[PDB]
Amino acid sequence: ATGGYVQNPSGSASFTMYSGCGSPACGETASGYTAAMNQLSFGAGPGAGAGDACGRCFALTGTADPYSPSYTGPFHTIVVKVTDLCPVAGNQEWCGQTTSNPNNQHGEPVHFDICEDTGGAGAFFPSGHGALTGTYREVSCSQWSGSDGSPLWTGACLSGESAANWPSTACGNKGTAPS
């Protein structure tokens, strides 16, 4: 996509959880399940505002535990709305994908950090299994439950929630992908 960001509607991803998404990079929260996406797919660097992932909805499916290969389940599928950025500089292990090294250390090209604040992390991760790998696919936000918060600053954007799936432009990417 423009800027060199990697924005495919479906593929492989890794998954973790985080707490604290009340001031997210898209500038607007949501009450349903939400996630941060690694910088190279989010479409903006830290402090740059909303990237083109903002507001888009994705079905996330766990398929493996990277710390226990023998674990065969149970896993879950949830639908999240992306509201936030998982930056290279703050989380290299999972979100360090760059144009020069497009996979994270766990071998995945995309990462979703699922927010605990609104329950998505508990819906997705079995207790005792807080990091997973699996798949993602962009879906209609009709499959997502919840409602959006109020914009935190001028430029806040979740307009990906009504856009056609990637490849396409809703909020738009900002700047250039991390190198």
Residue numbers in the entry: 5 to 183
Question: What do the study authors state?
Answer:
Here we describe the first crystal structure of a beta‐1,4‐endoglucanase from a brown‐rot fungus, Gloeophyllum trabeum GtCel45A, which belongs to subfamily C of glycoside hydrolase family 45 (GH45). The enzyme consists of a single catalytic module folded into a six‐stranded double‐psi beta‐barrel domain surrounded by long loops. GtCel45A is very similar in sequence (82% identity) and structure to PcCel45A from the white‐rot fungus Phanerochaete chrysosporium.
GtCel45A is ~ 18 kDa in size and the crystal structure contains 179 amino acids. The structure is refined at 1.30 Å resolution and R free 0.18. Surprisingly though, initial hydrolysis of barley beta‐glucan was almost twice as fast in GtCel45A as compared to PcCel45A.
